[PDB]
Amino acid sequence: FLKNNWVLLSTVAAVVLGITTGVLVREHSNLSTLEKFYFAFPGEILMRMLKLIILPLIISSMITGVAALDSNVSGKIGLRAVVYYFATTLIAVILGIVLVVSIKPGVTQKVGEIARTGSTPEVSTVDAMLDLIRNMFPENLVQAAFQQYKTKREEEYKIVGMYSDGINVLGLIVFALVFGLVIGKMGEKGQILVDFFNALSDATMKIVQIIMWYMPLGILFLIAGCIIEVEDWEIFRKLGLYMATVLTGLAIHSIVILPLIYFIVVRKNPFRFAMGMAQALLTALMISSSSATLPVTFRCAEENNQVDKRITRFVLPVGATINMDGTALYEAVAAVFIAQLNDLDLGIGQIITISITATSASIGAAGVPQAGLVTMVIVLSAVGLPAEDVTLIIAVDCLLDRFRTMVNVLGDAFGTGIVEKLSKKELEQMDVS
């Protein structure tokens, strides 16, 4: 078993050791504010090392996957993937609404005891929905590689725009898809570009494999530092039911709904599918970033369970940005909890409004600095509640974001096989032409 499953064993041992180190240092020592940063420094180095790979990997993988197919086949596969993602997001939103309504956590608790932290960002709903489309088509490609576009109202108000930092994944993916479609059709004129991007993708995969060797040491200090940062257990005890209901929703989704759909579509063991991606699930748990974890998910999905290259190369980059299942669940649950905190009546129209708003805003908050706060503000504004109440959950927002990424990765892994089976006729038909 050793020397072949070394990476997974090292990751598990690092997780256990980091938990032990963090709890011991917190319980039997006291550190200053500055020293915790120097204790978590290796985690930051690992996080920037993983952040750097994202751009070339995403671009080359998307271009290769799109150019490896034909126009009609690419259209059909993209349509199937989009339909599957939308259906699973809508089902997740319904599940979250039903669970949070049935549990009724906010009624028993009192608003006065809970303390507020952080601030409420200024959000305009229509402006955000238009910013999505504006970012879909950036003005500059080089600027789109590390910057995003934002618009705010100012003055009977006029619109003024500005550029802020942050890689624009959506616009890059759209342009890569168009470029891959074009050079797939060019043929003998675009073969050199296809070869260039294939080589770039392979080199990026090798660099990722190199980074995976150092990953466990970073993970140890990442976990230890994250555990150290907690101030007291009173905030967790007061908000225990909120974590209970979000985690119950995520677990129910992951264990029931996705394997059930997999069984209605295909016929195999969904749990054999799920157990082969433990490395990717852990990667998601500690790194907690769907884009950063993409190389690991790619590698595990390609190697462990033998999936075809075209389906993986085309489904994984799209599912990185579009698939938002845990996010929507958390938005719905937290928003309804906030509504319960205040005096409100749960009408059917209001529930339908929340159901639509959670999905729409979660799709809107696909890639942004703080998706959760913006989505919560949009949902509250649609309902009519004040936007200041987003501050309460911030103290316990970080914990769930670790499991949301794991759920998203599992959903992408299941959807890859689902689409593969669905379009298995085309793969065989076009193999010789």
Q: How far apart are CA 429 and CA 433, in angstroms?
A: 8
Burial class (CB in 10 A: 0-12, 13-18, 19+), 242: buried
Q: What is the rounded CA–CA span in Å between residue 247 and residue 403? A: 8
CB 65 within 8 A of CB 181: no
> Could you identify the residue written with the tokens 């065989």?
428
138 — phi, psi (to 5°)?
Answer: -70, 160
Which method, experimentally, gave rise to this model? cryo-EM
DSSP one-letter code for 374: H
- By the 10 Å C-beta count (0-12 exposed, 13-18 middle, 19+ buried), 39 is classed as middle
Query: Alpha-carbon dihedral of residues 144, 327, 395, 25, nearest 10 degrees?
Result: -90
- The answer to whether residues 290 and 402 touch, using CB atoms and an 8 Å cutoff, is no
Quote the tokens at residue 278: 């433990």
**Rounded to whole angstroms, how far apart are CA atoms 103 and 96?**
11
CA dist 329 and 349 (Å) reads 19
Distance CA 402, CA 289 (A): 8
Tell me: is residue 26 an annotated ligand-binding position. Answer: no
- 96 among annotated binding-site residues: no
CA–CA distance, 134 with 364 (Å, rounded to integer)? 12
CA gap 214, 174 in Å, rounded = 33
Terminal alpha carbon distance of the chain:
43
Tokens of 329: 């669940």
DSSP conformational letter for 394: G
362 in a known ligand binding site: yes
| 363 appears as a binding residue in the annotation | yes
Between strands 147-154 and 158-165, the pairing is antiparallel
d(CA 285, CA 281): 6
Assess contact for 375 and 362: CB atoms under 8 A.
yes
Would you call 113 exposed, middle or buried from its count of C-beta atoms within 10 A (0-12, 13-18, 19+)? Answer: exposed
Resolution in angstroms comes to 3.0
Cα-based distances in Å from 347 to 58, 90, 333, 353: 44, 20, 16, 10
Q: In the chain, how many H helices and how many E strands?
A: 20, 2
Is 408 annotated as a binding-site member? yes
**What span, in angstroms and rounded, lies between the C-alpha atoms of 330 and 138?**
30
**412 annotated to bind ligand:** yes
Does 343 belong to an annotated binding site?
no
- Supply the DSSP symbol for 253: I
Flag whether 167 is marked binding.
Answer: no
Q: What is the DSSP string of 162-206?
A: EEEES--HHHHHHHHHHHHHHHHHHGGGTHHHHHHHHHHHHHHHH
**3-class secondary-structure state, position 385:** coil
Residue in the structure block whose two tokens are 């075809």? 308
Neighbouring residues of 284: CB distance < 8 A, sequence distance ≥ 6: 290, 293, 297, 402, 405, 406, 408, 409
404 marked as binding residue: yes
**Annotated binding residue at 312?**
no
Judged by DSSP in three states, 102 sits in helix
d(CA 183, CA 68): 10
CA-to-CA separations, 3 to 6, 119, 163, 217, 359, in angstroms, rounded: 5, 49, 48, 18, 45
Find out whether 365 is annotated in a ligand binding site.
yes
Q: Is 101 annotated as a binding residue?
A: no
Q: Other CB atoms closer than 10 Å to residue 6's CB: what's the count?
A: 12
DSSP bridge pairs for 162: 150
Q: Where are the domains of the chain?
A: 5-430
Q: 288: left (phi > 0), else alpha (psi -120 to 50), else beta?
A: left
Exposed (0-12), middle (13-18) or buried (19+): which is 157, by Cβ within 10 Å?
exposed
Sign of CA dihedral 411, 276, 317, 132: positive
Cα-Cα-Cα-Cα torsion 273, 274, 276, 281, nearest 10 degrees, comes to 150
Give the CA distances from residue 227 to residues 9, 25, 31, in Å, rounded to whole numbers and listed in that order.
Answer: 21, 10, 13
327 known ligand binder? yes
As its CATH architecture, domain 5-430 has: Orthogonal Bundle (1.10)
Asked if 339 and 383 count as a contact pair (C-beta separation under 8 A), the reply is yes
Give the residues after which the backbone of the chain is interrupted, taking a C-to-next-N distance over 2.5 angstroms as a break: 155
Q: Is 319 marked as a binding-site residue?
A: yes
